[PDB]
Design an enzyme around this catalytic site. Structure first.
Site, PDB file in Angstrom:
ATOM      1  N   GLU A 137     -67.420 -81.485 -20.566  1.00  0.00           N
ATOM      2  CA  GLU A 137     -66.034 -81.530 -20.075  1.00  0.00           C
ATOM      3  C   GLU A 137     -65.398 -80.164 -20.279  1.00  0.00           C
ATOM      4  O   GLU A 137     -65.141 -79.764 -21.412  1.00  0.00           O
ATOM      5  CB  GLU A 137     -65.196 -82.589 -20.807  1.00  0.00           C
TER       6      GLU A 137
ATOM      7  N   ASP B  97     -53.190 -84.660 -25.309  1.00  0.00           N
ATOM      8  CA  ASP B  97     -54.054 -83.910 -26.229  1.00  0.00           C
ATOM      9  C   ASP B  97     -53.566 -84.020 -27.677  1.00  0.00           C
ATOM     10  O   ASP B  97     -52.379 -83.878 -27.948  1.00  0.00           O
ATOM     11  CB  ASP B  97     -54.149 -82.438 -25.808  1.00  0.00           C
TER      12      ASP B  97
END
Ligand SMILES: C=C(NCc1c(COP(=O)(O)O)cnc(C)c1O)C(=O)O
Ligand SMILES: C=C(NCc1c(COP(=O)(O)O)cnc(C)c1O)C(=O)O
Ligand SMILES: N#C[C@@H]1N[C@@H](CO)[C@H]1c1ccc(-c2ccccc2F)cc1
Ligand SMILES: N#C[C@@H]1N[C@@H](CO)[C@H]1c1ccc(-c2ccccc2F)cc1
Ligand SMILES: [Cs+]
Ligand SMILES: [Cs+]
Ligand SMILES: [Cs+]
Ligand SMILES: [Cs+]
Ligand SMILES: [Cs+]
Lengths: 248, 399, 399, 249
Positions: free
Chosen positions: A50, A61
């Site tokens: 990724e 995040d």
């Protein structure tokens, strides 16, 4: 006829194991070092990579990734550095998807980004703030440039929305979050045979092994960034430990 | 209605303004709130409760006041001030808060969260949670806690917990990011009381529906006092709630000019502004497709303004739609222009405005010079200046 | 006219309460103000001008809010708050100031002077003078400038000169003395806008006439919301304007109890208080024969209270007369009692009162216990607490 | 009958001069020193002494007098000390009137204070915050105890109020306040033959002599307090120069 990542999951499913899916953000600690780290992941045995696109307001995040992407942005990282990262991974023999918030894609152009992602050898897109409800342009771009579309499901997902999200996904479904992870993976298996990746703040070999018992993929990110911050050798060692984990 | 979005939250069809740019992790609670709003907006019990509180608690209606001593500073036009500054808590924010706070209690949520920049939405949210007995947590950027400190202490006195946000620009956009992360984690028990007309569906529509009362009162009041509809209606624009609130009742009156004034900070050429329509472009940010200040890759650009309330690089999607359609015009006002108007309103009418609202008055003065003698201009006076007295006294050398 | 004094300003007989204990040097301008007021109080065009400002500028009527979440601390009595906190400037003071400033313009005066303790009258006067283009000088005790600094800054932004008084106790009584000295020297061009229901005739009557609106509105509102006249109406008592304002309309309702609450400070036994009716005695002070705190020789005893607005050793003569008549009861409330009520109101109803007003709220809670379940008590919530936020935050350990 | 202060003004007018009227506040700088100071005024040629009663909130006193009355009150000065000062002044061959704000008189009792002031040899009362409109009790006590009643007039006083204030006064009218002062005295003389004392912040022989052209008495206060602060010898010298000023031939 079939998804881009399908042969990777079948090769894992033939060797009786889960795929190790490794996240790093482009441009941390700088652009050349991040690409050298992503190459190291291919060598250390990550089945899928990724490639994170740093975003200024990364809502989903956690603190380790947020601070790394903040640092990459201070250092001048650009969206094109991600497509250069995908190309370097693909030449090294790795398989890359891009994980990005949606505004960077809109700005670039959804079709143009798909086109250029595909030309770099990219296999798909992970979209944490794009639900299928808004994904009409992406669906069309995905079909034309032959890219997997990995949407996220959650423990909170209603039955109706879980079905709709799984149906809209090609490649795998990113099941993000006590017994919540296996229960969520179970609910996806009840309506579809698509591979399921599980991201659970995995730090260790034992944790990756537990996840491999029910998930087709183990997703690691936070721990990989923490490892790279100490050093590039520390990343190799950890990635090799996690590679052994998914084979149990 | 003619002006409402589709069921997905899109205004204007294929332009695609609004919608929901959120993670699947939030969709269960977003769908829960949307459904609860649709149910409660037609429930006579809910509307009776909201009405009772607007009258007896918040002090509605707010008056409409012809500021005749401003007229000579505005080309002899007639400036009418819609006095949202006189509401309980000292701004328009209370209108939206009483609606959403009543809704939180109807849904069985046991905790309310909110973001604040100027501290007025924070204070209003804390107020309603005191009144209804809900746990309250306000997220406020660290630069805002310092320059709007009066409101931090009010919030704490009202029983609200305040969390100073130290990430990014330490202002409203960063407070919104933190409150979003809280909601993602605590969705099952927590209601997000969002204070402006942005965000994913249903927030832009719902916030506007609760603020519509301003324009409905204004439209009746101006016809009563002036004998006709205005030549223009104006307001300052942060995320867009006070502007859309006053504008909405005039949308279908074709001779009524609508002007929103956005914060230009040190000037639009300086890179230290919040002039979203003047310098920004289309993008997905904070749950909607609207305008925002962003760089060539789509990274959000940090805004700057002397006004904490307008210091936001985004704007609400209904405004993007009205700009596209040519129904509203959006114009920049600098820190200096806003403060000149602040001082002028103090000396001419004895009204100490919010620095947010001062941007609208400054724009109104310029629009008066364009429209000329006898033109009738309704200005939304969104808040009072209690919170800004130290900043303004420092600006004018009064210490 | 039934409750009015004679032409000399006396309540209860030709040598009773009130009158004019002033020097001959002030009598020309006192007679000028008296004549002007007698003319204008019966002019419909004047009352129209005052009404129009009350409605459109000040936002009257103020609402009546049933504070149901106080009930359990008031013996299950029903506390109704008359919300003068929602007026322009944040207090009842604006009612009187609009009347007196309109009168100053009618008289052709170009300069207005005022005293202030809490700074709410000073701000109200500055506000009206900015609105009407009058030069404004405010006298304020040095101790009060330090503890009500938000209001000093507001007055200065509004264009007023603020003079800090260092004589005596450096609080309200000393501000009054300085304002009086200014007026003596500048009677030709200067109007003295006196901020409470005390002073020489015509001030007690004029100030009361401009505050009557509070009680007139409240009497209509309470009958509407509760279905009957109240069991009691209560207010705090500084010099007495907000109390007399709300009381006046209920004076001929024999079933309605009236209770004024005075600042008892550290306690009436300590000698650090402002409990004029509890601890004082009759005498001549600041223009009137009324009650004041005084020693064996007739020297004024300096008052103390945490509330700057109640820190005054005297009281208006109409209150002295009503006390002597048996129509109003006046009772002490301490700093602590008031701060407990301040805090309770923030916490339970989301209203931050003035510390002055929190004395009335504190008194209503005790009265509620005395009268019991279902008793209807109207409380004058004279002002908001934004000026007191720093003091209150410190009191409750919140910075 | 004649006013108590009548003989003083008649005597001054026969010697072609004004009466010197000297003010000091009781208790400044302390009670004994103030009594010594007031005795010095009698010895140095003050025709009448105004014994000031220090008040907590003296609105009509200037800065010099206000600081001095504050200092007296910090020293613990009482109203009965003013009565003692009047006794001492009477014993020394002098003539005292009291200047007081009204509330100390109310607290003492109006009839009782008038009785005790007359008993001490006091001749009258100067009342800067009592106007004739509120003076019913005082007028009764004034007639009963044979005390003069000195009300103030100002340049702003209307014709009606000036006439009513002069009519209500006995002994002298205090013309408190540049051509304002002669004009104000001129207005009092047009309605009545009562003596008029004039206060003008006098500090020198020359000013006292100017006022003595048109006025029956010259009132001096601030400058005596300033003189006493320096010392008792300075007060004696100043009073001597003012006593020379009031004389014309
Ligand atoms: C952001 C906040 N206030 C914005 C604000 C604004 C701008 O916000 P709008 O949502 O654009 O109305 C205008 N006027 C006043 C008095 C305000 O306080 C806040 O209080 O949290
Ligand atoms: C003395 C002053 N205020 C008194 C005051 C009072 C007491 O004053 P009254 O004149 O008794 O109403 C009550 N409530 C508020 C909010 C006040 O500000 C002043 O602001 O000058
Ligand atoms: N993931 C994701 C998105 N990256 C961030 C920036 O947009 C984050 C975000 C933040 C806030 C909101 C929001 C705003 C108002 C009301 C309700 C909301 F949820 C939505 C998304
Ligand atoms: N001389 C004399 C009096 N010593 C002081 C008090 O006894 C002084 C005084 C002070 C103030 C007032 C007053 C108050 C309100 C309105 C108008 C006023 F004038 C009157 C008198
Ligand atoms: Cs109102
Ligand atoms: Cs609460
Ligand atoms: Cs903006
Ligand atoms: Cs009092
Ligand atoms: Cs404390």
């Amino acid at each position: 006829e079939a998804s881009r990542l399908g042969p990777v999951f079948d090769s894992c499913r033939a060797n009786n194991r889960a795929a190790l899916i490794g996240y790093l953000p482009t441009g941390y600690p700088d652009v050349p070092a991040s690409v050298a780290a992503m190459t190291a992941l291919v060598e250390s045995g990550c089945d899928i990579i990724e490639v994170g696109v740093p975003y200024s307001d990364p809502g989903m995040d956690g603190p380790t990734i947020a601070r790394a992407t903040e640092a990459a942005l201070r250092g001048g990282v650009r969206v094109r550095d991600t497509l250069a990262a995908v190309e370097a991974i693909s030449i090294a023999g790795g398989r890359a998807v891009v994980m990005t918030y949606w505004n960077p894609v809109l700005r670039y152009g959804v079709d143009a980004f798909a086109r250029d992602l595909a030309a770099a050898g990219g296999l798909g897109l992970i979209t944490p703030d794009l639900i299928p409800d808004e994904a009409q342009q992406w669906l069309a771009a995905s079909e034309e440039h032959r890219l997997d579309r990995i949407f996220l499901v959650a423990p909170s997902s209603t039955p109706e929305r879980l079905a709709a999200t799984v149906e809209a996904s090609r490649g795998f479904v990113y099941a993000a979050s006590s017994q919540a992870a296996p229960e969520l993976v179970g609910r996806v298996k009840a309506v579809s045979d698509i591979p399921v990746g599980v991201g659970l703040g995995v730090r260790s070999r034992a944790q990756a092994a537990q996840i491999a018992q029910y998930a087709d993929g183990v997703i690691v990110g936070s721990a990989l960034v923490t490892a790279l911050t100490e050093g590039l050798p520390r990343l190799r060692a950890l990635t090799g430990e996690l590679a052994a984990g998914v084979r149990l | 209605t003619s002006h409402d979005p589709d069921s997905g939250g899109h205004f204007g069809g294929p332009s695609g303004w609004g919608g929901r740019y959120v993670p699947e992790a939030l969709m269960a609670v977003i769908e829960e709130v949307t459904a609860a709003y649709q149910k409660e907006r037609v429930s006579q019990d809910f509307l009776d409760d909201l009405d009772r509180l607007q009258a007896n608690y918040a002090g509605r209606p707010s008056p409409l006041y012809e500021a005749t001593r401003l007229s000579q500073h505005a080309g002899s036009a007639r400036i009418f001030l819609k006095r949202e500054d006189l509401n309980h808590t000292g701004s328009h924010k209370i209108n939206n808060v009483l609606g959403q706070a009543l809704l939180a209690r109807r849904m069985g949520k046991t905790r309310v969260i909110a973001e604040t920049g100027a501290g007025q939405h924070g204070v209003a949210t804390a107020t309603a949670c005191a009144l209804l007995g809900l746990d309250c947590v306000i997220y406020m950027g660290g630069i805002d806690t310092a320059r709007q400190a009066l409101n931090v202490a009010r919030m704490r006195l009202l029983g609200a917990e305040v969390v100073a946000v130290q990430t990014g620009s330490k202002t409203l956009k960063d407070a919104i990011n933190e409150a979003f992360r809280d909601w993602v984690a605590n969705a099952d028990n927590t209601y997000y009381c969002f204070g402006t007309a942005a965000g994913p569906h249903p927030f832009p529509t719902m916030v506007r529906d609760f603020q519509r009362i301003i324009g409905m009162e204004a439209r009746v009041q101006i016809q009563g006092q002036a004998g006709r509809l205005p030549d223009a209606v104006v307001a300052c624009v942060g995320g867009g709630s006070n502007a859309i609130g006053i504008f909405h009742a005039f949308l279908d009156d074709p001779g009524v000019r609508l002007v929103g004034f956005e914060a230009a900070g040190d000037g639009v050429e300086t890179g230290r502004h919040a002039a979203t329509f003047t310098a920004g472009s289309p993008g997905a940010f904070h749950g909607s497709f609207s305008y925002l200040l962003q760089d060539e890759d789509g990274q959000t650009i940090e805004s700057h303004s002397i006004s904490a309330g307008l210091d936001y690089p985004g704007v609400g999607p209904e405004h993007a739609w009205l700009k596209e359609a040519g129904r509203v015009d959006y114009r920049p006002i600098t820190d200096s222009e806003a403060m000149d108007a602040f001082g002028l309103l103090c000396r001419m009418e004895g009204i100490i405005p919010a620095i947010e609202s001062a941007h609208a008055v400054a724009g109104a003065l310029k629009l008066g010079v364009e429209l000329g003698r006898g033109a009738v201009i309704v200005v939304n006076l969104s808040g009072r200046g209690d919170k800004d007295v130290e900043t303004a006294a420092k600006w004018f050398g009064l210490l």
